Paper text:
Here, we report the discovery and characterization of Cucumis melo agglutinin (CMA1), a new R-type lectin from melon. CMA1 comprises 291 amino acids and is predicted to fold into two linked β-trefoil domains belonging to carbohydrate-binding module family 13 (CBM13) and placing it into the group of R-type lectins. In contrast to other R-type lectins such as ricin, it lacks a catalytic domain. We thus conclude that CMA1 is highly specific for C2-substituted galactose.
All residues of the N-terminal construct (Val6 to Asp132) could be modelled, and unambiguous electron density permitted us to locate and model four cation binding sites (three in each structure) and one sugar binding site. However, only the alpha site was found occupied with a carbohydrate here. It is found in a shallow groove, supporting our data on the lack of a distinct distal binding specificity. We report a tight coordination of the O3 and O4 hydroxy groups of the galactose residue involving Asp21, Asn43, and Gln41 side chains, as well as the Gly24 main chain nitrogen. CH−π stacking and hydrophobic interactions occur between the aromatic ring of Trp36 and the alpha face of the ring as well as the hydroxymethyl moiety of the galactose residue, additionally ensuring specificity for galactoside over glucoside as an equatorial conformation of the O4 hydroxy group would lead to steric clashes and loss of strong hydrogen bonding. Inhibiting binding of CMA1 to the GalNAc chip through a dilution series of N-acetyllactosamine (LacNAc) via multicycle kinetics allowed us to derive an IC50 of 1.4 µM.
Numbering used by the authors: 6 to 132
């Protein structure tokens, strides 16, 4: 079943669409957690992760590719399919790369990177 949640990463900050804008290609970052819609993510059985009607996708499939939101219908399965493991690893299924934070200061855009089991690579769910 789909579950709506916050995605909580390094230092208890939340995955956040910068500025709250739902336009295609707006990047994601870490931001102090709050009730705003751009921090509410729906994990679906189809493998997508959605906010504001859009899908989390990397802009590419290589280490260091940033993540952003995009139209779920302007995305192929490779772009939009993720798997959140119980230990916190959030894997981009096609590439096997993992969602990785790049700082807790403002506008630190998240990327997909080779898994190093870093503290920047562990994502928890919370109501
Ligand atoms: C036009 C304008 O100034 N809009 C802003 C919003 O963009 C802003 O939304 C927040 O932006 C931060 C990043 O700076 C986070 O993404 C946060 O989750 C958003 O809520 C709001 C609040 O600062 O202020 C204006 O509305």
């Amino acid at each position: 079943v789909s579950r709506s949640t916050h995605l909580v990463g390094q230092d208890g900050l939340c995955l956040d669409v910068i500025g709250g804008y739902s336009d295609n290609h707006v990047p994601t970052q870490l931001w102090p957690c709050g009730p705003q819609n751009n921090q509410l993510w729906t994990i679906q059985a189809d493998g997508t992760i959605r906010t504001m009607g859009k899908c989390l996708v990397p802009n590419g499939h290589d280490p260091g590719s940033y993540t952003m939101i995009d139209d779920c219908n302007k995305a192929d399965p490779n772009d939009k399919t993720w798997k959140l493991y119980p230990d916190g690893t959030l894997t981009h299924v096609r590439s096997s790369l993992v969602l990785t934070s790049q700082g807790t200061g403002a506008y630190a855009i998240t990327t997909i990177e080779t898994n190093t089991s870093a503290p920047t690579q562990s994502w928890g769910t919370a109501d």
